[PDB]
Every structure is written in C-alpha cells, then in structure tokens.
C-alpha cells in the first residue's frame, strides 16, 4: 500500500546513500567489494522493511544471497545491527580487520533518511500484506558502477554508459497472480557538481492496484533502446536504466532478446510502466503470436526476452511493422 511504498522510497534513498558512499569516501573508494556492497544494500532493504512491517522480511527476494565468502573461505551470514558496533564487527570479519572501512560502511548503514514525497503522502491505499512479494535488484549495472565514468555525454538524453546507468530497483508483485503492483527506481548518480564532486540522484515510483494507477511526477518514427551486447536505435547500459528510458519517454520501446534478464531486473519497472498504461511482454511469444509474471519460475530468468513499452499503440505499431520484416 501507500505506507509500504513510502517506506520503500526512503530505504531506496538509503541504498542510494550507501552506493554513493562507497564511491565518494576515500577509504571505501580504495576497496570482492562489488558483491559485498550489493549483498549489503539488499540486506539493508530487507531488514528495514521487516523492522517497519513485521512479517514482510520473509517475502523479500533478491538477486543476491545473504552469505558471503571472505578471504579465508569462511561463509558469513550477513545480519546487521542492532547497534552500529555489531555491524562494524561483521564487516571487519569480511574485510580482513579493515577497521576504517568497516566503521565507514557501518556509519552509512545505520544513518537514517527522512526523504518523503508529498504526492505519495496524501495517497491512502491499503493492500493486504499477505499477498505481497518483493524482488530487489540492489545495484543494477555493477559494471558501470565499478568503472565510475562521470563524464559521459548523452545521445538524445540517453546515456550509453556512465554512473547515470546505475539503478536500485524494488518491485512488489501479487503472490497469487504474479502481477506487479508497486515499483521504486532510485538513480543515485544523476547530476554531479564539478566543483564539489557530490552526486544528486532521483527516485521514481508507481502503483497499480485493483484498477487504481498512480505514479510519480514525470519531468517534461520510433526510438528503441538495446543493451551493449545485444545481437532510432540507441545503445544504453543497465536493465533498470533502459526501462527508465521508456518510463520517462526518452525511448518508446526497450527490447532484450537474450534470456539474461530476471524478475528482479524488471519487476519494479514493470509496475511503474503498468501504472502508466504500458507494460512488459514476452518477446518470443510476441514473435510467434502476454505480460511478464513474477510468482512462477522456469530459473528466475525472463526466458524469451522482453519488450517494454509505455504506450500500447507504439507497441502495436512496432510489433507488426517488424513482423512484416
Ligand atoms: Ca542486476
């Protein structure tokens, strides 16, 4: 519901703060660190949501595990808190006693965010907690996150690479039907002040529940986004980011032809697209003549690719203009 969604927004901003901290703090910027940061972000989301809505933590699924393997081969279960000191102890057990980085990470983890949307605050929508499942993609496009290019110029507003392609994705779906219900996308690196080097981000949200469709305020023949490895048309890194390009209208269609996207790549974006009248369809099923669902597996890959669209009319146009070859 709207309350769950507001909490999801706040903790998406917390995840954005962690992702920014690991790149703007010298000690963390020195530092498998991508896997640690991803597992950390996902566990932060899960624990915050379970603490605010008890019983929800068991329904939060994600790309990452909650176990890590340190340098010695010990498998460490990632449980944080309740105090900052225990988180420091856990992290130092993962980081070979690196006390500076452990303390910095635990500082960003336990720091709390008060980041609200006044549009969402007036909305009073209630959804039974028992029907909700959650797919988290804690840091999408980890390659662009590690590369760290701050200086890329967009083509027609579409960044082909750069920190702008990194998203945090939180998607809520109906457990019984598989339909996506709510979505949060957090872009942690949208604009960088050249003089202070500090990054500002942007959040986007959407909700489609029993015929009610709301979404965040959007800023003001066919354009198509595809991935880098994919084998008018623009290349862009990031699954969440290309979906966002469709959401914002910078591209009308996003196609992915391989089987290497997953429910956590696409759930949140699908929910926002649904709240605007669009969706995501199975590509292969379209090409032999069907929305994506998120309760049943295969294992959690979107087999047969996907098409993401904001307008059904543009989808029909593109669909049968190409199946004519
Ligand atoms: Ca991913």
Author numbering: 1 to 31, 48 to 236, 262 to 272, 284 to 341, 350 to 358, 366 to 392
Paper quotes:
Inositol polyphosphate 1-phosphatase (INPP1) is a prototype member of metal-dependent/lithium-inhibited phosphomonoesterase protein family defined by a conserved three-dimensional core structure. Enzymes within this family function in distinct pathways including inositide signaling, gluconeogenesis, and sulfur assimilation. INPP1 catalyzes the metal-dependent hydrolysis of the phosphomonoester bond from the 1 position phosphate of Ins(1,4)P2 or Ins(1,3,4)P3 to yield inositol 4-phosphate and inositol 3,4-bisphosphate, respectively. Conserved secondary structural elements comprise juxtaposed metal binding pockets and define a shared sequence pattern of D54…E79E80…D153PID156S157T158…D317 as shown for INPP1.
